[PDB]
Amino acid sequence: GIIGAGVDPLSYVPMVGVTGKGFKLINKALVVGAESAALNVASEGLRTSVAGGDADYAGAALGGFVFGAGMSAISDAVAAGLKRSKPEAEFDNEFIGPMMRLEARETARNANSADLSRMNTENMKFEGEHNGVPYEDLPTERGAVVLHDGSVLSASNPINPKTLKEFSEVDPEKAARGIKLAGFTEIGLKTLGSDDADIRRVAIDLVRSPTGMQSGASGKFGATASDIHERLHGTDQRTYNDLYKAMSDAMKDPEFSTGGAKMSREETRYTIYRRAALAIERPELQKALTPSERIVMDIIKRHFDTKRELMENPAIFGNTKAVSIFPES
Amino acid sequence: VPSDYDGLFQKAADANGVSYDLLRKVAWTESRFVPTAKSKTGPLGMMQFTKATAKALGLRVTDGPDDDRLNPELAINAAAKQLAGLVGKFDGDELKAALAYNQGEGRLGNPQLEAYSKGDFASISEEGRNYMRNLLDVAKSPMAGQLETFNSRSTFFGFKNAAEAELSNSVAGMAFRAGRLDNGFDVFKDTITPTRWNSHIWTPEELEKIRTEVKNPAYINVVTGGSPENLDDLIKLANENFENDSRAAEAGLGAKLSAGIIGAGVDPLSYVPMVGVTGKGFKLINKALVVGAESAALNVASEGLRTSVAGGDADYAGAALGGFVFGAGMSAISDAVAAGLKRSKPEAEFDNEFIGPMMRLEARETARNANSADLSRMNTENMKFEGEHNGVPYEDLPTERGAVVLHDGSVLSASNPINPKTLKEFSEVDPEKAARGIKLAGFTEIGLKTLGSDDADIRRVAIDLVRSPTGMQSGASGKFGATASDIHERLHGTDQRTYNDLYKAMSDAMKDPEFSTGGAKMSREETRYTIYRRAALAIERPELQKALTPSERIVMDIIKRHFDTKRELMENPAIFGNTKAVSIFPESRHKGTYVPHVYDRHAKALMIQRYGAEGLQEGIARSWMNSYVSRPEVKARVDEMLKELHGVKEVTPEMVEKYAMDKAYGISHSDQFTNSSIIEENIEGLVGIENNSFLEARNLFDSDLSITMPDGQQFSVNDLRDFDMFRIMPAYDRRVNGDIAIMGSTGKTTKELKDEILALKAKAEGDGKKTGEVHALMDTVKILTGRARRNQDTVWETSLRAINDLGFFAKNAYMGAQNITEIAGMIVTGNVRALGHGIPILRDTLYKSKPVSAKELKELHASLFGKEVDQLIRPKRADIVQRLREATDTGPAVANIVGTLKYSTQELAARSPWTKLLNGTTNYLLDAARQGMLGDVISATLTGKTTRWEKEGFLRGASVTPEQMAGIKSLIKEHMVRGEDGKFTVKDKQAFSMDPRAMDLWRLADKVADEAMLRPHKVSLQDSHAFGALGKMVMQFKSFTIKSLNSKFLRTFYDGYKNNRAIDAALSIITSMGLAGGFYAMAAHVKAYALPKEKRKEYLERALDPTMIAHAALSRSSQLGAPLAMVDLVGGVLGFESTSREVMGAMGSNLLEQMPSAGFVANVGATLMNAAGVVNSPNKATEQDFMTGLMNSTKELVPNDPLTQQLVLKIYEANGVNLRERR
Amino acid sequence: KDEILALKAKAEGDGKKTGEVHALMDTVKILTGRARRNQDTVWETSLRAINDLGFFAKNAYMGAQNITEIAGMIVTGNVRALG
Amino acid sequence: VMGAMGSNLLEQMPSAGFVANVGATLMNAAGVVNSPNKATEQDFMTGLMNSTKELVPNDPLTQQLVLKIYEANGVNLRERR
Amino acid sequence: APEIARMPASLRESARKIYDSVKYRSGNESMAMEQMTKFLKESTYTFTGDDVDGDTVGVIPKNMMQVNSDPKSWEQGRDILEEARKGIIASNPWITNKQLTMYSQGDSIYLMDTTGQVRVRYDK
Amino acid sequence: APEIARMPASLRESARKIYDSVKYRSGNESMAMEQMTKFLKESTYTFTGDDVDGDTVGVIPKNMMQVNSDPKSWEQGRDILEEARKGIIASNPWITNKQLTMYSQGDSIYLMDTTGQVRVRYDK
Structure with missing residues (x-):
């Protein structure tokens, strides 16, 4: 009970050693039916x-709970101070x-x-779909749409569809062409x-059809360019998350964190x-x-070694007449 | 009662955990079981909702078809x-x-829900109040x-309803009037509630934490008192309990029972659940029963x-303590049941x-x-x-049924798996299951005959293959080589030793937290x-x-060393005598x-x-070519082979592509490389x-x-392959040992020797x-x-033969072997x-000696045929069956079609609590x-009857389209023969x-x-009415399980410790x-009807007794997940089923041995x-090999945990036993 | 490129x-x-992935909503x- | 649907066999080729946590410091509704 | 012990408090067990199978069998419940004395066999 | 317990001090629990739902509800707050009683559901 109990983080000591570790917020009450499995x-x-994980998440959650409860207290106090000036004003x-x-x-x-x-x-x-996510605007809370299951995303939640749609509609000079031109699903249907003969040949090599009336039984026994691209995106993204954690650990060492700020x-x-x-290299x-x-x-070396191995043998995918885009083996 | 949606309702209940009775009776009220119900209001669906x-x-x-249409499963x-x-949301309030x-809810719902909340059912509308009154049960x-x-309540006394309601002021009528049948169990x-730590599959991080920090992972399984909040507390509690139990064992139940389990009249029934007791301090030296007692x-x-x-000596001690507890408790159960029966009939003795x-x-x-x-x-x-089964004499004791006595005075009771009388009698009367086997001849017989x-040619081939034990010829230089027989024995012995090593290693491996501790993953x-x-x-990688x-x-490492040694023997089969023996191995230079x-038959299917035939072939070829490029x-070795x-x-790449296509043709269009046990089962003609x-x-x-593949899914040839070295390592060993023996004895290959013969x-x-x-x-x-x-x-x-030998020479091993087999016999007879x-x-019907009815005989025929057909068409790979069962759930399908994140089957799988809890x-x-x-479907199809599984819903629970069901009928008609009697047969089997x-x-x-059978949490008699003999037998087994779970001891144990494991x-x-035992009984009744009328009574009286049914249970009852088979761990050489000068020669042999096995400690x-160790190994199996094989083999039959033996005992006590009769 | x-x-x-x-x-x-x-x-x-999580992975879905709501609170404050 | 099932039923790549x-x-390269093209749910979730690790501080202390800075500063409070 | 092995739900917390209190005051674990057993026996009736051993079909809290406000009238509900047990045994022969289980949910007494086929709910 | 659970958090430190004081005065933690619990009961009023299992919707300190200088005016403040909760539920039937929660901040009393729809402030 951070907020069911009315905890005021403003009247708190600087809270130095607290890193969030034994913080599982189970408020008694707000717990109705409660399966153990x-x-x-x-x-x-x-x-x-x-x-x-579950530990840095807990730290972020505890910090966010402290911050949000304190900001609620701050807003209430400022509203009281303003009501002193003008009692007929409610604020939010x-x-x-x-x-x-x-x-x-x-x-x-x-x-x-x-x-x-x-x-x-x-x-x-x-009704109201940003990217296939339906939502209802709540009149009660500014912004703050509600999702299909009843989950309500407040305004300023970075993912809620109405803020995303409105930001797209009114975005200062910074709105650019981007990737709005077309997507792989549209490309497959069009081409x-x-x-x-040539258009369809190149399309069969490059783009895969999600659903088509052709439905080729032996259209291609290869990976295809689209699937290779998506696979490589996924593997690179996993490697990026691995590198992100590794580098966070690396820059948390005493050399950069403890003493006077060296850089x-x-x-x-x-x-x-x-x-x-x-x-x-050496x-x-x-x-x-x-x-x-x-x-x-090790992470960076393994990534670059794997990339080189895929450049050298691009025939590890379907095509057998694929030969070493790598410049200097 | 059933209305073609019980499968869907049950699935949608296990997923989205909710009462199946709730959903079914909601169907009752809303639609009365029609998928589209015409209503004036506008709702049109199975559940009658359009609304929002x-x-x-x-x-x-x-x-979404939605407002107009809805998929009934969805x-x-x-x-x-x-x-x-x-x-x-309403806590657990079903109503x-x-x-x-x-x-x-909202407009008219919420006021009524609030009124319900404050009692106040008067404010609740009449319709909703009636709805809840319907659902009260x-x-x-x-x-x-x-x-x-x-x-509709069974009369307490007298006539129904009015007699107890309008009248019977006396208590019984009162108890009737306050009944309120629940029928919602x-x-x-109620009984086995899933906890947090049960049904929680570990993440890799938790797995590593458990592996590092938990001394004995089995202590994670117990949850005593309140559940620990986090895994760190669970680990701490587990370690504390482990140290306490290790500290307690010295004065624990093992030490207390180490003196006189049965001489002291200890009653294991009045015992606490024995959770920590692992039988480590249990050496049963009863004072008294110790006469002369040499220390050396x-x-x-x-x-x-x-x-x-x-x-060893520790898992043996655990098995012994469990067996002593179980046997003493079963003796107590027998005495108590005999006393209860003597209440009814005082002049009845029982046994x-x-x-x-x-x-x-x-x-x-x-x-x-x-x-x-x-x-x-x-x-x-x-x-x-007098009376020898395999050269072992015995005397029948009149005093004890069965129970012969051996030469030294050792008495083996009936149901002891090794006693000669039970083995002989099981051989004489065994249901259809007795086959040709290896009774044709053995190496000694061929040696004398040929x-x-x-x-010249016959004797040449014989001298190459078979060694003569004793002959008039007695060749001084007959052959300085191994001969095929000795190679075969040597390879059998070394394979058996490495099988016992693999057994131990695999048991240790599969006891680890990933598979034993958390919620049952697999x-x-x-x-x-x-x-x-x-x-x-x-x-491989x-x-x-x-x-x-x-x-x-x-x-x-064990598997790698085994396969490396086999390859080394196949490459150089001249390590044995024959110098002109050359490389049966197919493709060397592939180091x-x-x-x-x-390759799995069903993976290929x-x-x-x-991608019927060319698709799978070209997929295999293309995956191989991916490896090549x-x-x-891979490119180097393939190019060298192709050049040669x-x-x-x-x-040219054309050559390697054509080679890959040709090699993939063998997998895609032929089952030569598949499992194909049945074709190997046929032996006539020496073709294969x-x-x-x-x-x-x-x-x-x-x-x-x-x-x-063209549909976008990824296929690797490894996906086809069958691992598991349970059917794979033994079969590979049999074939390669045969080939190794042929080339090591004769310079010729298997083909050349066959052609010569x-x-x-x-x-x-x-x-x-x-x-x-x-x-x-x-x-x-x-x-x-x-x-x-x-x-x-x-x-x-x-x-039996090896234990007789042990009795002659190794006393302690002899007695330990007798003890383990006696424990196994008592477990099975109990x-x-x-x-x-x-x-x-x-x-x-089945354990009874009285012959079954004609209809019951037809049901038995159908059930045994269903078992045979299952053995024919079941997927052998456990992965295949698990994924097939899991994937059909709605979650995996919807995630595959709509989902943007991949997920995986066994994460979106619904899974019954029967699998999550109580998996085995x-x-x-x-x-x-x-x-x-x-069996039921096949019998119905051949007889023409339409099953209750024909209708749309149950097929929808599987992937059986309207069409595939008709195809199934056609297939059953084409390949199954309806016998003149209920007997069922298959045309062409393999086809x-x-x-x-x-x-x-x-x-x-x-x-x-x-x-229909396992997913529901309810067993009722009407459930058993539907299915046939095997179906109702397994339903009564499920009912037995539920009864045992509700037994006082088991309820108390689960409440105290959880521990579903x-x-x-x-x-x-x-x-x-x-x-x-049930399968044995059904097959025995079938075989009895196979006999002439006069002999049926004698045969059923002789073949259906506790001794033979118990021996059948010890015989089969194959543990599903047993590393390797019990035959592999202990199995004699197939050909080998059965003056002082030769003695002096053998002495001169063992005087000189200087092999590393003799010089070094094992x-x-x-x-x-x-390969050197295999070649230098003796052909005869040593006594320690047999003894370790016996303990490993019985590790499946005889549990090592005393706790599970006690739980089995208390289940039996809550159940009850038969007591035989009279003498 | 030349072919196209x-x-x-x-x-x-x-x-x-x-x-x-x-x-x-x-x-x-x-x-x-x-x-x-x-x-x-x-x-x-x-947003798309969190919708999918809400369909299938309840705990992950709720954690993702919590972290995104915390980010929104921080930025709006x-x-x-x-x- | 049944085609996609018949695909995922057979998988014996090491990522399936072994714990992560x-x-x-x-x-x-074998792992990259055998990887599915679609991003899995654990990949997205770890990516989300790592990406927000910059926006949302893991230290409760810095969140408290930010909060007290804001308290000493003030807040607008919107108006009316 | 039937009262402690099959301790009903609310009496679990009451008995834990009594056990803890006596253990704290005396240090003796035997005194705490005797007090907690005394409380459970005074506050419950243990239904027993009228057999050689059908013993402990259930431990029901005494206040759940109570009819009217008189505390001593729990015996009337006990007689009703035992007549119910006998009627269930006699009505269904396949159920024996060892099959029945008596246990209490939050506000109900449940009398059921080892299977789930027969359950009758007795509420205050 | 409704007071020890939830707890107004304006009394958390006072209850801490009282528990310590009674534990040290009489070396008995049961007495310390009893005394700090009774302190919280006397200094707070527990609001409860209308349902039959009526649970605690909130615990608000007694002084925060006083309408006039009489220390017993917390009764009238309580009556006003109960009426306010009834009115909030009646105006918005969407809120099941379990959503609606009452708690006290440093100076004011908030009753609000487990959602951003309804939040009503009640200053002394």
Whole structure:
């Protein structure tokens, strides 16, 4: 009970050693039906794949709860001060709704059942789709649409569809062409339906059809360019998350965090990356890396070795007449 | 009652955990079981909702028919999710959720829900109040009593209804008037509630934390008192409990029982659940029963128990303590039941049937631990013995039924698996299951027949293959080589030793937290498959080895060393005598460990259902070519082979592509390289002895890299491959040992030797003597190549012979072996008695000696045929069955079609609590239920009857389209013969297994079995009314499981400790043994009807008794996930079923031995023999090899945990036993 | 690239074929990374993925909502205070 | 649907057989080729947590410091409704 | 012990408090067990199977069997419940004395066999 | 307990001090629990729902509800707040009683659901 109990973080000591560790917000009350077994093997816990998950998440959650409760207290106090000037003025908290729903969600998440922050979706027509996500505007709370299951995303939630749509509609000079031109699904329908030999040949090589009347039984026994691109995106993204955790560990070492600030954070990142790269090029330097930088260098080396291996043998995918785009083997 | 949606309702209940009765009765009220119900208001659906619910939460991400149409599976799932949300939102109040469902919410719903909340049912509308009154029975609500206060009941006494209602002021009428039948019992809601730590599958991080920080992972399974909040507290509590139990064992139950379990009259029934007791401080030296008691052993043999695996004398102690507890408790149960029966009939004696064996077991164990003077030994004076099963004399005791006494006075009770009388009698009267086997001839017989009768070629081949034990010729220089027979024995011995090593390693590997601690990720069979597959993949790609836990690392090392040694013997078969022996190995210069390439029949069938023949072939070829282009070593070796083959200096990519296509043709269009056990089962003609399949499956490519198929899915040749080294390692060993023996003895290959023997037949087609000789030679080749077939019966007869030898020489090992087999016999006979009492169908029809009716005979024929058809068409790979069962759920399908994040089956799988909780029992019940369903469907189709599984809903639960069901009918009509009697037969057998529709048949049967039989949490008699003999037997077994879970001891144990794992182990053992006995009974009744009328009574009286049913249960009851088979761990050489000068020669042999095995002390845990060790190994199996094999083999039958033995005992006590009769 | 330019030159007449070859050209531009997805794809991709999580992974879904709501609180508090 | 099932039923790539590595996948070319093209749910979730690790501080102390800075500063409070 | 092995739900918390209190005051674990057993026996009736051993079919809290406000009238509800048990046994022969289980939910007494086929709910 | 659970958090430190004081005065933690619990009961009023299982919708300190200078005017403040809760539920039937929560901040009393719809401030 951070907010069910009316905790005021403003009247708190500087809270130095607190790192969030034994913080599982199960508020008693806000816990109705409460299963001990999860419904699926999915769900169960937080599905992160980095080490130390459920702990840095707990730290972020505790910091966010402290901040939001304190901001609610600040807004209430400022509203009282303004009411002193003009009693006939209400103002909006703008934090305590989101914070109450956040306590309810976290409570149900840790108690495993019955999110009480959820809206009653009866008599809601929804309508209004940003990217295929329906929502209802709440008149009660500014912005703050509600989703299909009853989950309500407040305004300024970075993902809620109405803020995203409005930001797209009114975005200052910074709105550009981007990727709005076309997508792979549209490309397949447009060009793989050509009835031309060369166009369809190139399309079969490049783009895969999600659903088509052709439905080729032996259209292509290869990966295709689209699937290769998407696979490489996925593998690169996983490697990026691995590198992100490794580099966070690397820049948390005493050299950059403890003493007087030797360089900026951007420079700590540059120095660690440069150490990894120089150690990759000259293996003699690897004995000079700390274990965290050693992990960073291993991740970067493995990534670049894998990329080189795919350039050298692009026939590991379907096409057998694919030969070594790598410049100098 | 059923209305074609029970499968869907049950699935949508297990997913979205909610009462199935709620959903079904909501269907009752809303629609009365029609998918589109015409209503004036506008709702049109199975659940009668258009409203806003429909689009509501579900859909909007997929082409939704919605307001106009709803997929019945999707409609039921969405309604179930809505009801689960309402039930959870209203704490657990089932009726409030029902009110919210019917009366809606918001406009008119919320005031009525509030009125319900404040009691105040008057404010609730009449419609909603009636709706709740309808649901009073199926709904669990705190408000149920208040609604009742605001009739199809069984009469307590007298006439129904009016007699007890209008009258009977006397108490009984009062109790009738306050009845309120509940009929809403859910075993997993009420009895076995899933905790947080049960049903929680670990993440890799939690797994590593558990592996590092938990001393004994089994202590994670217990949750005493309040549940620990986080895994760190669970680990701390587990370690504290482990240290406390280790500290307590010295004064614990093991120490207390180490003196006099049965001489002191200890009653294990009045005992606490024995949770921490692992039987470590348990040496039963009963004071008294110890007469003369030498402290020094007579020989270096004897001394201790001669097992060669590490941890022996400790797991033996656990098995002994569990067996002593179980046997003493079963004796107490027998006495109590006899007293209760003597209440009814005072002049009735009955038999304990346990206390004789237990008294003698205490005497043997006492003498074994005190080293001298077994007091269980009978006085053999005035005994003529006579009667030999395999050269072992015995005397029948009149005093004890069965229970013969051996030469030294050792008495083996009836149901002891090794006693000669039971083995002989089981051989004489065994249901259809007694086959040709290996009774044709043995190496000694062929040696005399062929090695010495006037023929240069015949004697040449015989001297090469068979060694003469004693002959008049006695050749001084007959052969300085190994001969095929000695090579065969040597390879059998080394394979058996490495099998015991692998058994120990795999047990350690699959006890680790990933498979044992948390919620049950996979079945035991599937854990075994995953570990074997991990080992094999790490062998093929060494980079994966860093991902193996140390236990799996040991497993992989054992498997790698075994396969490397086999390859080394096949490459150089001249390490034996013959110098002109050359490389039976197919493709050398491919330097790497060859894990045999065998491809699942059903994986190929799946890859043919889509991409029929050319698609699968070209996918295999393209994955191989991916390996070729990707890795330069693969390219190098393939190019070298192709240059050598085509005699061309350069290799074009066209050549390698054509080679890959030709090699993939063998996999895609032929089942030579598949499992194909049935074709090997046929032995006539010596056709398939040529062309070893394991060697021909060899190719130079790597099956590791995958190719994207035209539909976009990725296929790797490794996906086809069958791992698990349970059917794979033994079969590979049989074939390669045969080939190695042929080339090591004769310079010729298997093909050349076969051709020579056929030439000899053609030459001596005239003479009867010479034809008999060439036939004996052919039988030798057939035994040697492994065609043969030793049968299951060899394990216990081999054990009997070896234990007789131990009795002659190794006293302590002898007594330990007798103790373990006596414990196994008591376990199985207690199971037979208890389940003959409990499960009805057994006692009334199958365990009874009285012949069954004609209709019951037809049902038995159908059920046994269903079992046979299941063995024909079941997927062998455990992964395939698990994924097939899991994927059909709505979650995986919807995520595959609509989802933007991948997820994976076994994460979106619904999974019954029967699988999550109590996995092993559920696996046994699913197998039996699927076989029964197969038999039922086949019998109905041949007889023309339409099953209740024909209708749309149950097919929708599986993937059986309207069309595939018709195809299943056509397939059953084409390949099954309706006998004149109820007998069922198969046309062409293999051709039937070939049909793609057989996969659909199996899928239908398995999904119907699950949904209709295992998934529900309720057992009722009406449930057993529907199914046939096997179906109702397995349903009564499920009822027995539910009864046992509700027993006072088991309820108390689960409340105190949770620990679903221990209850699962106990009930799994019960179900395995009971299903074995039931199958034996059905086959025995069938065989009885096969006999003439007069002999049926004698045969059924002789073949249906507790002794033979118990021996059948010990015989089969194959543990599903047993690393390796019990036959492999202990199995004699197939050909080898059965003056002082030769003695002096053998002495001169063993004087000089200087091999490393003689010079060095044996390795602790893994011999890891190389080719030199195999060649230098003796052909005769040593006594420590037999003893470790016996302990490993019984590790499946006889549990090592005393706790599971106690749980089995208390289940039996709550059940009851039969007591025999009279004498 | 040369083949696609040759196809464009060949089918310079037909409007439909010019649209097709321009679609192929856009495919190559996307594929080689010319493209440019912009910063806005982060939150829209997160919205789609979090909707999918809400369909299938309850605990992950709720954790994602919690972290996004916390981010929104932090940024809106910053906007208010610095305004 | 049934085609996609018949595909995922057969998978025996090492990522399926083995438990995931703790802290670094270190994928090689075989792992990249055998990887699914669609991003899995754990990939998205770890990406989300890592990406927000910049926006949302992991230290409760810095959140308290930001909060007290804001308190000493003030808040607008919107108006009316 | 039937009262402690099958301790009903609310009496679990009451008994834990009594056990803890006596253990704290005396240190003796035997005194705490005797007091907690005394409380459970005074506050519950243990239904027993009228057999050689059908013993402990259930431990029901005494206030759940109570009819009217008189505390001593729990015996009337006990007689009703035992007549119910006998009627269930006699009506269904396949159920024996060992099959029945008596247990209490929050506000109800449940009398059921080992299977789930027969359950009758007795509420205040 | 409704007071020990939830707890107004304006009394958390005072209850801490009282628990310490009673534990040290009499070396008995049961007495310390009893005394700090009774302090919280005397200094706070527990609001309860209308349902039969009526649970605590909130615990508000007694002084915060006083309308006039009489210390017993917290009764009238309580009556006003109960009427306010009834009116909030009656005007918005969407809110099940379990959503609606009452708590006290440093100076004011808020009753609000587990959602941003309804939040009503009640100053002394």
